[PDB]
Write a protein that holds these residues in place. Structure first.
Motif, PDB file in Angstrom:
ATOM      1  N   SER B   9       3.577   1.448   4.730  1.00 27.78           N
ATOM      2  CA  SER B   9       3.485   0.791   6.024  1.00 27.78           C
ATOM      3  C   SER B   9       2.073   0.315   6.391  1.00 27.78           C
ATOM      4  O   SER B   9       1.911  -0.486   7.309  1.00 27.78           O
ATOM      5  N   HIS B  10       1.044   0.827   5.694  1.00 29.94           N
ATOM      6  CA  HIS B  10      -0.358   0.435   5.810  1.00 29.94           C
ATOM      7  C   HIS B  10      -0.574  -0.957   5.270  1.00 29.94           C
ATOM      8  O   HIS B  10      -1.227  -1.810   5.873  1.00 29.94           O
ATOM      9  N   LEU B  11       0.070  -1.128   4.119  1.00 35.01           N
ATOM     10  CA  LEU B  11       0.170  -2.355   3.362  1.00 35.01           C
ATOM     11  C   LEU B  11       0.916  -3.442   4.134  1.00 35.01           C
ATOM     12  O   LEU B  11       0.546  -4.611   4.043  1.00 35.01           O
TER      13      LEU B  11
ATOM     14  N   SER C   9       2.625  11.841   9.685  1.00 37.16           N
ATOM     15  CA  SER C   9       3.096  11.031  10.798  1.00 37.16           C
ATOM     16  C   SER C   9       4.112   9.950  10.406  1.00 37.16           C
ATOM     17  O   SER C   9       4.785   9.394  11.271  1.00 37.16           O
ATOM     18  N   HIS C  10       4.208   9.630   9.105  1.00 33.13           N
ATOM     19  CA  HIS C  10       5.176   8.712   8.509  1.00 33.13           C
ATOM     20  C   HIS C  10       6.567   9.292   8.556  1.00 33.13           C
ATOM     21  O   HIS C  10       7.546   8.644   8.930  1.00 33.13           O
ATOM     22  N   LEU C  11       6.561  10.574   8.200  1.00 33.72           N
ATOM     23  CA  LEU C  11       7.690  11.477   8.217  1.00 33.72           C
ATOM     24  C   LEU C  11       8.222  11.699   9.630  1.00 33.72           C
ATOM     25  O   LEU C  11       9.433  11.806   9.812  1.00 33.72           O
TER      26      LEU C  11
ATOM     27  N   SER E   9      -6.712   5.145   8.464  1.00 33.40           N
ATOM     28  CA  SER E   9      -6.341   4.875   9.844  1.00 33.40           C
ATOM     29  C   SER E   9      -5.800   6.095  10.602  1.00 33.40           C
ATOM     30  O   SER E   9      -5.715   6.072  11.827  1.00 33.40           O
ATOM     31  N   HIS E  10      -5.407   7.154   9.874  1.00 29.83           N
ATOM     32  CA  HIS E  10      -4.964   8.445  10.396  1.00 29.83           C
ATOM     33  C   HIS E  10      -6.113   9.194  11.023  1.00 29.83           C
ATOM     34  O   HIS E  10      -6.027   9.743  12.123  1.00 29.83           O
ATOM     35  N   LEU E  11      -7.201   9.124  10.262  1.00 30.66           N
ATOM     36  CA  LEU E  11      -8.512   9.640  10.584  1.00 30.66           C
ATOM     37  C   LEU E  11      -9.115   8.944  11.802  1.00 30.66           C
ATOM     38  O   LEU E  11      -9.780   9.596  12.605  1.00 30.66           O
TER      39      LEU E  11
END
Ligand SMILES: [Zn+2]
Lengths: 21, 30, 30, 21, 30, 21
Positions: B9-11, C9-11, E9-11
């Motif tokens: 989903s980053h992609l 957080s994807h989960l 981006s989590h960071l």
């Protein structure tokens, strides 16, 4: 492709813009 | 710009910001 | 649907879309 | 569980719906 | 709180929630 | 730093609050 260029390898801005419309 | 491996989903998010009004095709084939 | 390992957080996001109005329990135990 | 089924292994749609209410 | 390696981006998102009104500096140097 | 403390190693709440203003 999209996953080998940008996820398997390190892409750039304009390699990502290639997959636009 | 990012110097990394964009995956998942980053992609798709990267592809969302960078193309904008043009849009994109996300095709995840190996 | 996704064919992958959903982690972090994807989960929790996957669990957010798929359950919807029912909601979910996120319990991260090993 | 949730982390071994869907993060350690590859889940599906209905294995994820199992953790709903 | 999280017990993990926060990356990308989590960071930056973690840094967004936790600082709030103060804000943050994201400096990704190795 | 920020990437070695919180991405290379496991941080906490207050190690992350250190990088605020
Ligand atoms: Zn992620």
């Amino acid at each position: 492709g999209i996953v080998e260029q940008c996820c398997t390898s390190i892409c750039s801005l304009y390699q990502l813009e290639n997959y636009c419309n | 710009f990012v110097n990394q491996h964009l995956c998942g989903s980053h992609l798709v998010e990267a592809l969302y910001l960078v193309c904008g009004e043009r849009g994109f095709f996300y095709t995840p084939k190996t």
